[PDB]
Amino acid sequence: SSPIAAIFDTENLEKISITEGIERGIVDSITGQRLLEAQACTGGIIHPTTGQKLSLQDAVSQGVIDQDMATRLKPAQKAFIGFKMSAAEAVKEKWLPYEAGQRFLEFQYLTGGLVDPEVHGRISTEEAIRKGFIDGRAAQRLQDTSSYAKILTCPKTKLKISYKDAINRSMVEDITGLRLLEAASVSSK
Amino acid sequence: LEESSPIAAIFDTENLEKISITEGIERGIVDSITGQRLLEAQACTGGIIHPTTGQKLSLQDAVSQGVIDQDMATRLKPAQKAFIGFEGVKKMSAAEAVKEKWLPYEAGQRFLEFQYLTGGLVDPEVHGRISTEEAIRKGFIDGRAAQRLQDTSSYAKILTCPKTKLKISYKDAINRSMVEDITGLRLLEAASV
């Protein structure tokens, strides 16, 4: 699946970047950062309208994310370009908290499979196991997308949801092909 | 296999058909305690598994859909809590609940094993599964408890295998289960005696 690219501000019926969603207060800062991390660790920050995958520096330049966010996303981008080492390895080497490494791997798994920084390519879970990125247990966890940590506050319902839930709830924009997550100022629940 | 999806339902060998655990109990091919435990394994891992759709259900919805009966839903509350979390007194995970005597050791242990065998212990905080390393980090279990979970071969035989009627562990159940072709749902065979 494609990563969630941007936010759909239901109340204002318009697509906005995750950053704007945060600015508007309809996507909390943590959730927003995590959505952005999901982009960085899977190829790059997604321009909300062009769909172009961007490096953090270009994202900042294009106004897709601000400098502070760019800073906080460094580990996420490295989960893609390498720390080269992968997020799983960074967690092992005490460079990245488990929580972070786990979501990065889930972000990658849900979007095509774990990323192997060394080749930019994705790899099968069998290969990730072989590479030591994950063990069979982690593989079963990853494959069981229904049990992913509810690390996001659904911007619309305000309930805790996983990134798989987010993808499930996301809608695709008219052929930009971009996956949008609806957001509201207050819970729709 | 060391880990796998939770057993979802029963394959009634005599009738060559998949039925819910509840139905297995009803037809007397799965005893109520074993059936309850198979259901606990589902409840503590996210939800009662709908036998046909595979969707995870709250106990309430499972009762509403006839997937489990009212009395069973009552008996499954602790297992569901093993997933959603035990009221803080900051929700407690199953392991913590055992420590605070809120959950009998046996029930807690069953739940931890069910989770472990199906991907990893559940962190009620984020309602997701975590590596054992992380569970240790969170203080859910210490190395000793982690070692116990790892030795799946030594899990208590808490189930009566629906087919052989012999006592087996959940690990055994998963190893003796069959994956239903189209659905990917894990079934345990059951026969009458």
Provide CATH code, domain B1-193. 3.90.1290.10
One-letter amino acid identity for B42?
Answer: Q
Q: Residues of A with CB below 8 A from B186's CB?
A: none
- Cβ pair A179, A5 in contact under 8 A: yes
CA atoms of A43 and A41, how far apart (whole Å)? 6
CB contact under 8 A, A137 and B130: no
Across the interface, of A99, A144, A150, the residue whose CB is closest to B119 is A144
- Degrees, nearest 5: CA angle A28-B119-B146: 105
Residues of chain A neighbouring B118 (CB-CB closer than 8 A) = 140, 144
Crossing angle of helices B105-117 and B32-43, in 10° steps, is 60
Answer yes or no: do B4 and A138 touch at CB < 8 A: no
Of A137, A146, A162, the CB nearest to B3: A137
Tell me how many degrees the CA angle B116-B120-B125 measures, rounded to the nearest 5: 120
H/E stretch holding A172: strand A171-172
Domain spans, chain A: 1-189
In degrees and rounded to multiples of 5, residue A170 shows phi and psi of -70, 155
CB neighbours of residue A76 within 10 Å: 26
By DSSP bridging, strand A179-183 and strand A4-9 are parallel
Distance (Å) from the alpha carbon of A131 to chain B's nearest alpha carbon: 17
Q: Two tokens at B169? A: 């562990």
Q: Do B123 and A149 touch (CB under 8 A)?
A: yes
Q: Cβ B128–A144 below 8 Å, yes or no?
A: no
Class of CATH domain A1-189:
alpha beta
The count of residues in chain A is: 189
CA distance B184 to B178: 9
CA A68 to chain centre: 17
Flag if A98 and B137 touch (Cβ within 8 Å).
Answer: yes
HEC per residue, chain B? CCCCCCEEEEEECCCCEEECHHHHHHCCCCCHHHHHHHHHHHHCCCCEECCCCCCEECHHHHHHCCCCCHHHHHHHHHHHHHHHCECCCCCECHHHHHHCCCCCHHHHHHHHHHHHHCCCCEECCCCEECCHHHHHHHCCCCHHHHHHHHCHHHCCCCEECCCCCCEECHHHHHHHCEECCCCCCEEEEECCC
B193, B15 Cβ separation under 8 angstroms: no
Q: How many other CB atoms are there within 10 angstroms of residue B151's CB atom?
A: 10
